[PDB]
Design a binder for this molecule. Structure first.
Ligand SMILES: NC(=O)c1ccc[n+]([C@@H]2O[C@H](COP(=O)([O-])OP(=O)(O)OC[C@H]3O[C@@H](n4cnc5c(N)ncnc54)[C@H](OP(=O)(O)O)[C@@H]3O)[C@@H](O)[C@H]2O)c1
Ligand SMILES: NC(=O)c1ccc[n+]([C@@H]2O[C@H](COP(=O)([O-])OP(=O)(O)OC[C@H]3O[C@@H](n4cnc5c(N)ncnc54)[C@H](OP(=O)(O)O)[C@@H]3O)[C@@H](O)[C@H]2O)c1
Ligand SMILES: C[C@](O)(c1ccc(S(=O)(=O)c2ccc(C#N)cc2CCF)cc1)C(F)(F)F
Ligand SMILES: C[C@](O)(c1ccc(S(=O)(=O)c2ccc(C#N)cc2CCF)cc1)C(F)(F)F
Lengths: 267, 261
């Protein structure tokens, strides 16, 4: 149910935002941009050193407030406790950016069922848990979920099966939740971010002698995600290219869903 | 260039506007809307008797001027001169609604080059003369050009082949000048209007024994043409089974041109 305005940094001033996987990469960048914009901000990841740093820049950059809570999203207790603790810290919640992911490498699949389950737990199941926990507050602010996904979450890829599965799962889970929200008269927006290669310490570390693509700036990536969510869009596409950024849209799907939109009109 | 704005009937009034093939069906309706919204309206067609019917109903509906001219658009001399005459009769021009077509019926194309030629003359070539004559005045007003087309102008259908050819012609031509303008700083607006079956007499006689879904009303259609016309949209769809309205769109093509530009 996209917005009908144009983005302005002020849409975020005074907004209370959680960003996860917020200690390096895109997550960091989002915190900073929300900082420049004068938002309350709660950030998270496992290492508390690195998080402190981020919290510093954020306060220097302009945040109405800025905290951090360290912990693994491997553990679901923390996930549901983090949310309750963070909505306390800022006194309520406007947007929830689900961004974190478990350490992955590019490698062929030969029997790593530990990695597959782990991907599923951290990259997918935690999202749902956090969303469950944030939903009450989100309702009462008419906030917004943002979810960060990938090419590999829309099309297949050899080096990253466990990761793809997890990303694909988000699409299916949240898109199918997005429907429920419409009919539910639930006024919380769900934005899915599909990204091509992005220049992160980590991404490069894992691709820099295998993949040939040009990667996009982490800084701009982050802003497009904040905006997409601010403008309550359904998908955000971002890739150095524009060939790609136009293909991942799948209108067959737009249709079929529109069609099957009226195979039922019952509660 | 798009516009996320919204349509109020007031975007019109005071606007200088031509409506071709107004003597019947959708043309009549477009004008009757422009009259119930009151702009300057010069209206063409051949039938002089019916082009009077229309010219007066428009006054008694609130047009800030109604006049007719009566000729056959087969005549490229006439066409160029109609747009002069109407240019004078109005002191400028904002919106040109190319709509006229030529007598067709469903028929399996055997060997009738004649119908193919007339179709290209009246349905494609003339609209091109109308435009070229109109272009100075529309430059001076940052106006809009509205081209009316059809399903048969996007995808193949049997039985209307002369037709489709002239319709497809309109797309290649106008979408291609459209681009010429943008990458040029020329602020003229070109709308292609892709319309499924509509409920009009000459269009009902023709499709007689063809299992169509109900033709959507000439009125909202006419309105739709005018709306997106005014809204300066690149293209405008409209079909009764609004189903179609979805996949009639061709996203595949959008991608291509973006890159070549
Ligand atoms: N960069 C790209 O080319 C690209 C392309 C498509 C999609 N994406 C998506 O963008 C998002 C972020 O990616 P990125 O490139 O910024 O990667 P990144 O730099 O490696 O982000 C890692 C973040 O997640 C945290 N994290 C890792 N394991 C965790 C765990 N078990 N529990 C809680 N937090 C954990 C890390 O913190 P700690 O390790 O300190 O806990 C760090 O804050 C991901 O959703 C990714 O799929 C990126
Ligand atoms: N009706 C549909 O089912 C439908 C569906 C798809 C597309 N369309 C499109 O809608 C547009 C208008 O269709 P319509 O249904 O409104 O058609 P229509 O009812 O037959 O009207 C045709 C108009 O064109 C005029 N005309 C015929 N020959 C002419 C000529 N040689 N020079 C100048 N004007 C001439 C007629 O006036 P005179 O007889 O007085 O000359 C009449 O005003 C066309 O582009 C058509 O392709 C309609
Ligand atoms: C988490 C990780 O950083 C990652 C980055 C990028 C994507 S991607 O789906 O966007 C992507 C984009 C472009 C291309 C190309 N050529 C390939 C991919 C798959 C990955 F190699 C997936 C995952 C990594 F590298 F696996 F560790
Ligand atoms: C000019 C005319 O009125 C006309 C109307 C409709 C279209 S159409 O291409 O848009 C169309 C629309 C719906 C369906 C369906 N079912 C079929 C068609 C093709 C026609 F057989 C083409 C032309 C006619 F019929 F030829 F006189």
């Amino acid at each position: 149910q996209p917005l009908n305005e144009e983005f302005r940094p002020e849409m975020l001033q005074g907004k209370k935002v959680i960003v996860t996987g917020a200690s390096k990469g895109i997550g960091r960048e989002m915190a900073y941009h929300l900082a420049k914009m004068g938002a309350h901000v709660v950030v998270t990841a496992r290492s508390k050193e690195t998080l402190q740093k981020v919290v510093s820049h954020c306060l220097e950059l302009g945040a109405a407030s800025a905290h951090y809570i360290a912990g693994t999203m491997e553990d679901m207790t923390f996930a549901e406790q983090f949310v309750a603790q963070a909505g306390k810290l800022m006194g309520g919640l406007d947007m929830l950016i689900l961004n974190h992911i478990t350490n992955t490498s590019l490698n062929l699949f030969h029997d790593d069922i530990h990695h597959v389950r782990k991907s599923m737990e951290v990259n997918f199941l935690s999202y749902v848990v956090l969303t469950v926990a944030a939903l009450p507050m989100l309702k009462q602010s008419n906030g917004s979920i943002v979810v960060v996904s990938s090419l590999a979450g829309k099309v297949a890829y050899p080096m990253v099966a466990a990761y793809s599965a997890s990303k694909f799962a988000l699409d299916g889970f949240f898109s199918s939740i997005r429907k429920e929200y419409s009919v539910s008269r639930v006024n919380v927006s769900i934005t899915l971010c599909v990204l091509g290669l992005i220049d992160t310490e980590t991404a490069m570390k894992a691709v820099s002698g295998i993949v040939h693509m040009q990667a996009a700036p982490k800084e701009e990536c982050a802003l497009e995600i904040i905006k997409g969510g601010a403008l309550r869009q359904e998908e955000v596409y971002y890739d150095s290219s524009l060939w790609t950024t136009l293909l991942i849209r799948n209108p067959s799907r737009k249709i079929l869903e529109f069609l099957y939109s009226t195979s039922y009109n019952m509660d």
